[PDB]
Amino acid sequence: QRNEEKAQREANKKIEKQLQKDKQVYRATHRLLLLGAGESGKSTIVKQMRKVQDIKNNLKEAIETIVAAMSNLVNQFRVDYILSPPEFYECYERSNEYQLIDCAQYFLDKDQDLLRCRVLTSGIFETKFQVDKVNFHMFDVGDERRKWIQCFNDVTAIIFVVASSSYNMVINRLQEALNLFKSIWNNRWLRTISVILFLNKQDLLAEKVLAGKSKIEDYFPEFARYTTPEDATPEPEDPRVTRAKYFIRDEFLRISTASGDGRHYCYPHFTCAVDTENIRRVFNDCRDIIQRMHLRQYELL
Amino acid sequence: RKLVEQLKMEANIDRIKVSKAAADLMAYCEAHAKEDPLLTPVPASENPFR
Amino acid sequence: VWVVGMGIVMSLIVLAIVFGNVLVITAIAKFERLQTVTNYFITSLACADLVMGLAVVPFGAAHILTKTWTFGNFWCEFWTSIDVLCVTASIETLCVIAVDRYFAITSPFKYQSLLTKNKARVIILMVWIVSGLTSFLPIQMHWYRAQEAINCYAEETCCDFFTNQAYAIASSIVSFYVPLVIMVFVYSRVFQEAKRQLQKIDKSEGHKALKTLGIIMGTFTLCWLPFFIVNIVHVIQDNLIRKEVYILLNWIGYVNSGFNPLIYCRSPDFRIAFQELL
Amino acid sequence: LRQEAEQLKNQIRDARKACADATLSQITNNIDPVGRIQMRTRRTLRGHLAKIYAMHWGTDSRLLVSASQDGKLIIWDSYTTNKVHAIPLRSSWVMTCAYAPSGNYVACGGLDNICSIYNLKGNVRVSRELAGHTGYLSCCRFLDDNQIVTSSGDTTCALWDIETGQQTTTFTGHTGDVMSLSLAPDTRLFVSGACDASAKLWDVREGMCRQTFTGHESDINAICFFPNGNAFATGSDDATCRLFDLRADQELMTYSHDNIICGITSVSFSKSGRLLLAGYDDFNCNVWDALKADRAGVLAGHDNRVSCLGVTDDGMAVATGSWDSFLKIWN
Ligand SMILES: CN[C@@H]1CCc2c(ccc(O)c2O)[C@H]1O
Numbered sequence: 020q021r022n023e024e025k026a027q028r029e030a031n032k033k034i035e036k037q038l039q040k041d042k043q044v045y046r047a048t049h050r051l052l053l054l055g056a057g058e059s060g061k062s063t064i065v066k067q068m069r070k071v072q073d074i075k076n077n078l079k080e081a082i083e084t085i086v087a088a089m090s091n092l093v094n095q096f097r098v099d100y101i102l103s104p105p106e107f108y109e110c111y112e113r114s115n116e117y118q119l120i121d122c123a124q125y126f127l128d129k130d131q132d133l134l135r136c137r138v139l140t141s142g143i144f145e146t147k148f149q150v151d152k153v154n155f156h157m158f159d160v161g162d163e164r165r166k167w168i169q170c171f172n173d174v175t176a177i178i179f180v181v182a183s184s185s186y187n188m189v190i191n192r193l194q195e196a197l198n199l200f201k202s203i204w205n206n207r208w209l210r211t212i213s214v215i216l217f218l219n220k221q222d223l224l225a226e227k228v229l230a231g232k233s234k235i236e237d238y239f240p241e242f243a244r245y246t247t248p249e250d251a252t253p254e255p256e257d258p259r260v261t262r263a264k265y266f267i268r269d270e271f272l273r274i275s276t277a278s279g280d281g282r283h284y285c286y287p288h289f290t291c292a293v294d295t296e297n298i299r300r301v302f303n304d305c306r307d308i309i310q311r312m313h314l315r316q317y318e319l320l
Numbered sequence: 321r322k323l324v325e326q327l328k329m330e331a332n333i334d335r336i337k338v339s340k341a342a343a344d345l346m347a348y349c350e351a352h353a354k355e356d357p358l359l360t361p362v363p364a365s366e367n368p369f370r
Numbered sequence: 371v372w373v374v375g376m377g378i379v380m381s382l383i384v385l386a387i388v389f390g391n392v393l394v395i396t397a398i399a400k401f402e403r404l405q406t407v408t409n410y411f412i413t414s415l416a417c418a419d420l421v422m423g424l425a426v427v428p429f430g431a432a433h434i435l436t437k438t439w440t441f442g443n444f445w446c447e448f449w450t451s452i453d454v455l456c457v458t459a460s461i462e463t464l465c466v467i468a469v470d471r472y473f474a475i476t477s478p479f480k481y482q483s484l485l486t487k488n489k490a491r492v493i494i495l496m497v498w499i500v501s502g503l504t505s506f507l508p509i510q511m512h513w514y515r516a517q518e519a520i521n522c523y524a525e526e527t528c529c530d531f532f533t534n535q536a537y538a539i540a541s542s543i544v545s546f547y548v549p550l551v552i553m554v555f556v557y558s559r560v561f562q563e564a565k566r567q568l569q570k571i572d573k574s575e576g577h578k579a580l581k582t583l584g585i586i587m588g589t590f591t592l593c594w595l596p597f598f599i600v601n602i603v604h605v606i607q608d609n610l611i612r613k614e615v616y617i618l619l620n621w622i623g624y625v626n627s628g629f630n631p632l633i634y635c636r637s638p639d640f641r642i643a644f645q646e647l648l
Numbered sequence: 649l650r651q652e653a654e655q656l657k658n659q660i661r662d663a664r665k666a667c668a669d670a671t672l673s674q675i676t677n678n679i680d681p682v683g684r685i686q687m688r689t690r691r692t693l694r695g696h697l698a699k700i701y702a703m704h705w706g707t708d709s710r711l712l713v714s715a716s717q718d719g720k721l722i723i724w725d726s727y728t729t730n731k732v733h734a735i736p737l738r739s740s741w742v743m744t745c746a747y748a749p750s751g752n753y754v755a756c757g758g759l760d761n762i763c764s765i766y767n768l769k770g771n772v773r774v775s776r777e778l779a780g781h782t783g784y785l786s787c788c789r790f791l792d793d794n795q796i797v798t799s800s801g802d803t804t805c806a807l808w809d810i811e812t813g814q815q816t817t818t819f820t821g822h823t824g825d826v827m828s829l830s831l832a833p834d835t836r837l838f839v840s841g842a843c844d845a846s847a848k849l850w851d852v853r854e855g856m857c858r859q860t861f862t863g864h865e866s867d868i869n870a871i872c873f874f875p876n877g878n879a880f881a882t883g884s885d886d887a888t889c890r891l892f893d894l895r896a897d898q899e900l901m902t903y904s905h906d907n908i909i910c911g912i913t914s915v916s917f918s919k920s921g922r923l924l925l926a927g928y929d930d931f932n933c934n935v936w937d938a939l940k941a942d943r944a945g946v947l948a949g950h951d952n953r954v955s956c957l958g959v960t961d962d963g964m965a966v967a968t969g970s971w972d973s974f975l976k977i978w979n
Pocket residue numbers: 453454457458531538541542545601620
């Protein structure tokens with residue numbers, strides 16, 4: 020009777036007490052979303068920021084997928100045996116047009132092998148790590164509609180990894196990746212969410228840029244007209260690629276800044292596979308996210 | 321292939337006049353109109369909420 | 371006839387303070403969305419302004435207009451305690467906000483953890499309890515009473531604030547001077563953070579912060595400093611001050627509470643609540 | 649090749665136009681209007697962490713369950729306003745919730761392709777985990793204790809058997825990612841809506857769609873059956889919400905407002921079906937006349953956008969969700 024109603028209050032108190040403890044933990048934790056194309060190599064950043072036989076088996080299968088695709092796109096028994104194992108174990112120039120794993124070429128020619136080539140996962144991969152700051156949880160979507168983006172509204176920042184070197188993979192892939200960046204920027208629901216984008220494969224970018232076989236002007240006519248910014252550029256790199264490096268950033272930057280002002284910022288970072296400081300770069304940029312969000316609050320900015 | 325097959329079954333579907341559907345739809349709403357607290361709010365004593 | 375004209379202006383000031391703080395207090399309580407960690411504090415400022423504009427100024431207006439205190443001797447002392455508690459609470463609360471804004475900007479990633487609904491009530495209660503050691507304690511021990519105009523404390527016809535040399539320095543330091551140093555120091559550091567962030571934006575792209583930061587500090591400094599610079603020098607140099615001069619600066623300070631909601635407003639949340647209210 | 653199907657598709661539309669004789673509003677013109685409805689908020693059930701996504705009433709109307717991106721699915725008691733159980737979620741993000749007709753089990757969705765059937769009856773534990781879809785799970789419902797109907801973002805809807813743990817029947821052939829589904833009171837049929845602006849119903853035993861509706865032009869996100877079971881209404885991202893009668897194979901009355909240009913998240917009929925309670929992206933919920941096709945009352949008691957709306961089996965009260973973690977129950 021009335022005791023049950025009193026009993027229900029005690030059960031409610033336990034739930035409220037349990038929820039209150041998690042409220043501080045949830046508020047402390049920060050959520051990020053990682054967006055990238057299949058060839059963007061977003062797994063490299065996640066692995067760098069944070070078995071071999073299993074990876075080798077998938078990598079060996081990946082080599083066959085590129086081998087089979089190359090023949091179709093253009094020792095027949097050996098090709099048939101591989102397409103259809105020690106017997107199976109016993110192109111790259113045209114790999115830009117074809118679809119292939121980035122680390123497949125290194126694997127095909129042949130300990131950081133896991134970092135170089137990693138097996139992808141269809142499911143959502145949640146990464147949790149601490150940088151001596153508040154708890155950080157990174158979420159990965161793992162489709163054309165991209166309706167799950169509208170679900171994300173509480174994330175402090177969005178990671179948008181771009182393969183800068185992958186501008187000659189016309190199916191241009193970079194313009195397609197740039198096109199998706201416009202859609203997320205102009206999203207009617209991403210009003211108070213910034214973006215942190217990494218121009219991955221910067222080292223690979225120079226190699227394509229240094230070699231004259233592929234010209235960036237062919238894909239982008241405005242590149243020849245575009246000139247290097249007067250701002251400081253780190254060097255150790257030739258200015259011929261340095262002008263190329265800034266152009267791809269300017270293309271991303273021009274759309275990002277023009278569309279909206281306030282609570283919509285982009286933090287382009289040039290990154291390389293060898294570099295492991297990207298974890299600190301995010302934290303430095305993540306700190307700027309909260310400040311600029313708070314500066315706009317109370318109209319102090 | 322399947323869409324043509326799926327659309328093939330769509331041809332053999334019996335249809336009814338819209339007027340007949342409208343009358344049936346309106347009649348059901350009239351029948352259940354009385355037993356609906358949203359249409360007429362329940363008395364405070366009768367309403368379990370307040 | 372000039373007395374009639376002065377009464378209209380004084381009457382409007384009391385009315386303005388009552389409505390201004392009421393709307394801020396009503397908006398916070400009525401809507402749950404507006405109620406936040408930072409917005410809990412402004413309720414205390416709204417509460418402090420509300421009592422000041424209704425229980426301090428209206429009685430003070432009668433004292434000047436009628437040129438005499440018709441109420442009893444005890445109630446005049448009670449009014450002084452309420453008069454000083456409200457000013458002490460209002461100035462301190464603005465200093466608390468300065469700490470709140472400083473932590474949000476200068477030390478992020480810990481504002482959510484440090485501030486809490488339970489934590490907000492503790493510091494707010496501490497600020498109000500701080501007024502108790504500044505307002506209730508003097509009247510209980512009758513230490514507020516002074517030897518010039520000694521009969522003024524005795525006589526019930528008219529009473530004037532005649533304070534000892536110790537209390538005038540100590541109360542002014544606690545009420546205004548100490549909050550001033552804290553408020554200026556943290557706001558200077560906040561301005562550095564805004565300058566640094568703006569410089570970073572211009573680094574990767576191709577001030578208004580001072581204008582909005584000036585209003586918060588300027589109104590606090592302009593509307594209180596002339597009184598408190600005189601609230602410390604009349605006691606040490608009695609001949610320097612004039613009786614009518616002290617009153618004029620005092621009523622300038624009371625206008626700060628009325629103008630306080632205007633400074634801490636214009637946010638999108640409060641603009642929506644203004645339309646909903648009217 | 650494709651020409652015959654296109655010719656057949658045009659012929660299908662011709663039959664629908666020929667099947668129409670009189671407009672629905674023409675018949676309902678003489679019907680007396682419901683009038684303005686002064687709608688209040690009897691309860692304000694709050695106390696959650698983050699934005700909720702879905703809500704479903706219990707069979708007895710005493711209880712309801714809400715699922716949120718905070719990962720805490722809590723079952724709430726309407727009368728006593730106090731929560732009964734809180735079920736932690738393995739997956740942080742959930743997009744659907746469902747309640748068993750028997751009330752013994754509670755189904756929770758998830759962005760990951762999993763539909764966990766939690767056991768209410770005193771430690772909550774998963775009875776089974778249903779998986780096997782490429783896309784995200786968007787809706788879940790309980791035909792009975794044995795059968796659970798789920799919607800996926802892989803453009804496929806499937807029925808799960810709890811004991812078998814496998815898809816007894818798979819419903820394919822649908823273009824867009826499926827957003828919402830509803831189950832008929834007779835449990836014989838159910839509907840499904842995708843971003844392809846196409847609304848289709850399916851027979852559980854047959855497994856093949858009976859009728860296909862494509863009146864809408866934008867993506868649709870809400871759908872529910874009329875209490876009579878012969879009609880359903882769809883809520884699209886476009887301002888218009890249309891009503892379809894399965895017998896007539898066509899849209900009967902379109903519910904649109906020129907002033908309203910926001911999206912629609914959830915829809916729900918009343919017990920008698922006169923009032924169509926529909927949420928909106930304009931932070932307000934609208935209740936419109938089913939027959940007169942005219943607005944009856946406007947309710948904007950929420951701060952964030954409404955994400956769900958359900959009506960009790962008894963019809964006593966309506967509950968609408970929000971992204972502000974405020975379950976405002978309206979009676
Ligand atoms: C007569 N009005 C009084 C006089 C002096 C005084 C006030 C407030 C706070 C103080 O710390 C004071 O010393 C004024 O409200």
